[PDB]
């Protein structure tokens, strides 16, 4: 808990309200849909697994993508190009050793050129005006994990899992703030694994009450419940690993009793 713990939290709370994408941008997209987006983010999860990239990179790339699609009409055929460039950019920003362009061109099955990917990289930087240091659900979970009295690995893994599942469905997660989704994911994971609830310390820190997190929590619980029958399965597959204590296999409570 550095002494800038509060300063940073407060600052991330400010930033999260600005790197904010248009909640209903998909309606205005002439050719793409939420389902197409879901397939894209799912694929990026797989790419993250393949190249052993940090979870933070995945979260940053999804942020870049929603912000780009928030102000750019893209056709089915170019959507993966935007996704690839976004992933490449988040890597350069977050990873110590980012995969080389050639590797990114590789995982797209030569659907695009090294030339195309780099051009798209340039365009994405232009649209986001080089503002890549975005707040993620991931960053808030990190913050919240410190206020976890009995630090539990399974709780942290499950929260990560839930936060990652929210990245797949624009509807309804695009309408919630990262700090709020992180809050819901934390409580839900905490409850599922230890029976404990959103901690008093976090209420003071975030200003969020179990009551305020309810809306998001209701949505997240449902996503958790139906996770096994979702068309996209990359995240569950990812989280049934030893590294994550196979938390995707845990049974979600039948009721939240909120």
């Amino acid at each position: 808990v550095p002494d800038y713990h509060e300063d940073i939290h407060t600052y991330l709370r400010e930033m999260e309200v600005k790197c904010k994408p248009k909640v209903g941008y998909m309606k205005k997209q002439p050719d793409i849909t939420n389902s197409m987006r879901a397939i894209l983010v799912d694929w990026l999860v797989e790419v993250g697994e393949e190249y052993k990239l940090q979870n933070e990179t995945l979260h940053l790339a999804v942020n870049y993508i929603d912000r780009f699609l928030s102000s750019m009409s893209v056709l089915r055929g170019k959507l993966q190009l935007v996704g690839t460039a976004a992933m490449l950019l988040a890597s350069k920003f977050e990873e110590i050793y980012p995969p080389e362009v050639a590797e990114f061109v590789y995982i797209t099955d030569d659907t695009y050129t090294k030339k195309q990917v780099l051009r798209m990289e340039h365009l994405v930087l232009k649209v986001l005006t080089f503002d890549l240091a975005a707040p993620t659900v991931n960053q808030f979970l990190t913050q919240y994990f410190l206020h976890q009295q009995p630090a539990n690995c399974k709780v942290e893994s499950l929260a990560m899992f839930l936060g990652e599942l929210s990245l797949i469905d624009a509807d309804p997660y695009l309408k919630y703030l990262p700090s709020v989704i992180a809050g819901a994911a934390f409580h839900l994971a905490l409850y599922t694994v230890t029976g404990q609830s959103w901690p008093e310390s976090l209420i003071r820190k975030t200003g969020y009450t179990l009551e305020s997190l309810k809306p998001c929590l209701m949505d997240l619980h449902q996503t958790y419940l139906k996770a096994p029958q979702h068309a996209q399965q990359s995240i569950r597959e990812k989280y049934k690993n030893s590294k994550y204590h196979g938390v995707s296999l845990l049974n979600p409570p039948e009721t939240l009793n909120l």
Partner: protein, 301 residues
């Protein structure tokens, strides 16, 4: 893009390197003088360098009087230009020029005070500079000093892991890094400042190591060889050898003679061994040493 470059008139190649080149340029329309950093992009055809990616996104998110200002970014097809506000000189060259006369304590205090403010601003915005050294610090004729060169800066919303090819030049490297710690923290930056603080006061570098081990030793030789009582956990660090010669803690009054009581108090807190106990930039700005701080103008050459 090309229309913008047309409005710039080159003046003199400030410096250069691997990144690219850094010219002093003049805006033909406004007369404004800027520092133009040219980066050739075909020297890899991997897109934009990671240092550019980080310096830009992080710099254009750090607006503070004590942090160099990135005015613009021009991305052409083969080159990438970073347009910075121009400052007359860096702290390294300034220290050389002040070798004979020395830098006035009031100016030293003014500079440390400012550096601590830009640094505190960085850390409170989750940014680690990770390369605070004299040449990366810029000063102007008004007595102001600013943190610059953010090529190795990292955002730490998520812990930043220790990397071998991306570290502060040896003389300013913190002991935790030398002893092989797993992550960086804001303390690594305070340690660099502490070394620069002392270097300004004495006119000579505090720990001029020749190797990683020689560096460690010069530090042990002055601050004393750390033990579990002074730094809980040292003995259990990756590169800590029990065979380390046990030295005693030199008397600060003899290390930084020119400094008064407060000056010594602050420096010792900036050079504390346990990174968890090392003073924060925020806290440092509250030290009695800055009780009577002023903003003198330098005697630039």
């Amino acid at each position: 893009p090309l229309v913008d470059m047309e409005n710039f008139q080159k003046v003199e190649k400030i410096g250069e390197g691997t990144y690219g080149v850094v010219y002093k340029a003049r805006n033909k329309l406004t007369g404004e003088v800027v520092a133009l950093k040219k980066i050739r992009l075909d020297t890899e055809t991997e897109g934009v360098p990671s240092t550019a990616i980080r310096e830009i996104s992080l710099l254009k998110e750090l607006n503070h009087p004590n942090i160099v200002k990135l005015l613009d970014v021009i991305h052409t097809e083969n080159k990438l230009y970073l347009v910075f506000e121009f400052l007359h000189q860096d702290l390294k060259k300034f220290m050389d020029a002040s070798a004979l006369t020395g830098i006035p304590l009031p100016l030293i205090k003014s500079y440390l005070f400012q550096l601590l403010q830009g640094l505190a601003f960085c850390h409170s915005h989750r940014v680690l500079h990770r390369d605070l050294k004299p040449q990366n610090l810029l000063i102007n004729t008004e007595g102001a000093i600013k943190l610059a060169d953010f090529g190795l800066a990292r955002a730490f919303g998520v812990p930043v892991r220790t990397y071998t090819h991306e570290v502060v030049t040896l003389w300013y490297r913190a002991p935790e890094i030398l002893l092989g710690c797993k992550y960086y923290s804001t303390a690594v930056d305070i340690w660099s400042l502490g070394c620069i603080f002392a270097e300004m006061v004495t006119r000579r570098a505090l720990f001029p190591g020749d190797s990683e081990i020689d560096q460690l030793f010069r530090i042990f030789r002055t601050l004393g060889t750390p033990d579990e009582v002074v730094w809980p956990g040292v003995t259990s660090m990756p590169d800590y050898k029990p065979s380390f010669p046990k030295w005693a803690r030199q008397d600060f009054s003899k290390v930084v003679p020119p400094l008064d009581e407060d000056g010594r108090s602050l420096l010792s807190q900036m050079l504390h061994y346990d990174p968890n106990k090392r003073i924060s930039a925020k806290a440092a700005l509250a030290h009695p040493f800055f009780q009577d701080v002023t903003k003198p103008v330098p005697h630039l050459r």
